[PDB]
């Protein structure tokens, strides 16, 4: 019978040590069976439903929990909620500010004047004068991400406890719901990497025969339409600036990691998508969507809201990128998308629980696979 239970973490990857502290390595979870047994159940017809599934809610809940557990013990940055004195960096002949602070030192009666650089997106003016504040201070507390915690996705396997079983559908053309005529039982799922993204789905699995479009209600414009590609598209993202880190004491063993000086040229972060692969892919997505609408299909840029919705928000290398996608959702060159970067993060719309992402020294190079799209709808 259908059931809702608690599944557990398992990991095939035990390659990493316990010093790198990956957030998804609970180090409380078992290795997977290196040779898992998949059993085909002949003559069964199992009704699957991705929209009413409970594995999604559980995975989501556990991700939130692990995230908070690793963040909780680290240094709070609420002592930095002071008026900031900021001027521009020499982005001269934009978005980086040079700010000074008065901070508490290890002995409470003394204060020190210190400097840090900030991205414009993390700092809001108070006055028309050079008086600024960190954006979270008039709403809530902010916590510094632990400097030693890795957020690189590890495929996580979800396995059932004894008395339960996981069934999977092996029908290559199967959409979100319906009877599956080829169903196997497994000890557990394959590993799914907890990749975080918005407009584009990165580093997931591919459809095997064609683009498969899955929607809870295809006639309801308010629903997310999930498009799974049957071919990946490489996306190359970078943070070209050579960053540095300044370690600032803000209390008795309380360390803050500030963006340090910029070395070399000041350049804009960006992502590279081949134009030809992008267009080929979108021609096929519209072609498949047409099977449900029998109408002309066009794509448009995101329409509004904050960066989390208007841009391609993703993490790479520990850095947080917000890339413009207007040249995608709208020759033979590479499409270069400008990206914005910000350090103050409010994950999963949990406004009031801010996190500060410390700077990473050196340059960042990312390679990712676009495996899908999330679309909504707004005539012939």
């Amino acid at each position, epitope marked *: 019978k259908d059931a809702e239970t608690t599944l557990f973490c398992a990991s095939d990857a035990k390659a990493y040590d316990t010093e790198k502290r990956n957030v998804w390595a609970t180090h409380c979870c078992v290795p997977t069976d290196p040779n898992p047994q998949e059993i085909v159940l002949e003559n069964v017809t199992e009704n699957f439903n991705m929209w009413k599934n409970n594995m999604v809610e559980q995975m989501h809940t556990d991700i939130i929990s692990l995230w908070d557990q690793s963040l909780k013990p680290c240094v709070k940055l609420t002592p930095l909620c002071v008026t900031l004195n900021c001027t521009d960096v*020499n*982005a*001269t*002949n934009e978005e980086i500010k040079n700010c000074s602070f008065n901070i508490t030192t290890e002995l409470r009666d003394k204060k020190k004047k210190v400097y840090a650089l900030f991205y414009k997106l993390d700092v809001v003016p108070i006055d028309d004068n050079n008086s600024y504040r960190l954006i979270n201070c008039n709403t809530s507390a902010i916590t510094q991400a632990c400097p030693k915690v890795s957020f690189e996705p590890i495929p996580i396997h979800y396995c059932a406890p004894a008395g339960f079983a996981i069934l999977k559908c092996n029908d290559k053309k199967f959409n979100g719901t319906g009877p599956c005529k080829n169903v196997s039982t497994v000890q557990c799922t394959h590993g799914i990497k907890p990749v975080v993204s918005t407009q584009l789905l990165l580093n997931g699995s591919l459809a095997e025969e064609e683009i498969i479009i899955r929607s809870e209600n295809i006639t309801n414009n308010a629903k997310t339409i999930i498009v799974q590609l049957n071919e990946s598209v490489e996306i190359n993202c970078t943070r*070209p600036n050579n960053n540095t880190r300044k370690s600032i004491r803000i209390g008795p063993g309380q360390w803050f990691y500030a963006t340090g000086d910029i*070395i*070399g*040229d*000041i*350049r*804009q972060a*960006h992502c590279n998508i081949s134009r030809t692969k992008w267009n080929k892919t979108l021609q096929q997505v519209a072609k498949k969507l047409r099977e449900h609408f029998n109408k002309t299909i066009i794509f448009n840029p995101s329409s509004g809201g904050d960066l989390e919705i208007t841009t391609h928000s993703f993490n790479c290398g520990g850095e947080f990128f917000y890339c413009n996608t207007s040249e995608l959702f709208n020759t033979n060159n590479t499409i*270069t998308l*400008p990206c914005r970067i910000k350090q103050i993060i409010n994950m999963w719309q949990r406004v009031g629980q801010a996190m500060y992402a410390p700077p990473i020294e050196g340059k960042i190079r990312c390679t990712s696979n676009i495996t899908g799209l999330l679309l909504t709808r707004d005539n012939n």
Partner: antibody
Amino acid sequence: QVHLQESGPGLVKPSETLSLTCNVSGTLVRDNYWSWIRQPLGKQPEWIGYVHDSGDTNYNPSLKSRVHLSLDKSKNLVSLRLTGVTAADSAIYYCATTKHGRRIYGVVAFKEWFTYFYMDVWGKGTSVTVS
Amino acid sequence: APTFVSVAPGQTARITCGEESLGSRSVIWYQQRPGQAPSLIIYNNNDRPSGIPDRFSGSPGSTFGTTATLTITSVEAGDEADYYCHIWDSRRPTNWVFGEGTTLIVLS
């Protein structure tokens, strides 16, 4: 080979307007960018500004308010007009042909580049003394 | 304005000029023989116009924290001159004033 033959009053009084010229021979005035450079005695050269056809003109911000450069397409002359002349303006002045290039350091689409300039042909220059 | 370097003929010169690079740099070097109008030696760090011998070369514009350098191989008597740099830098205002140069004294 172009010859830039400069000319001027030599000796001027304080608060007078200085007008220097440059007879361009072998090339046309509209063929390249023109610039003026001055070198006070005992000092390194100072770039006054540049003038060009197609409207591409710019000035040394410290001199700008007193100076106008121009190109005479009829007489093939390059000229410099400086008002408010003072003792500090005594210098050897030069007419020169300016060539340029571009350096790219980042993404061209984001304008991560700049123009750089150099002076290829210098005239003999003129000596300007302010009483 | 210029400082001095003493080089016996046949010895090399080390001429430096300007402040440290902050970002990509493009250095223009000029040669001023006393009594002469000045002329171009190098543009764009190491590109020389025709007529300039290859004994004249200099520092790359790819480094940061370094200063412009002109190295003259086997200095000749005809190289006695005031060497000046004009510095373009991606993180600075345009320099309308030449940097402080160096007089190359040939000890012949």
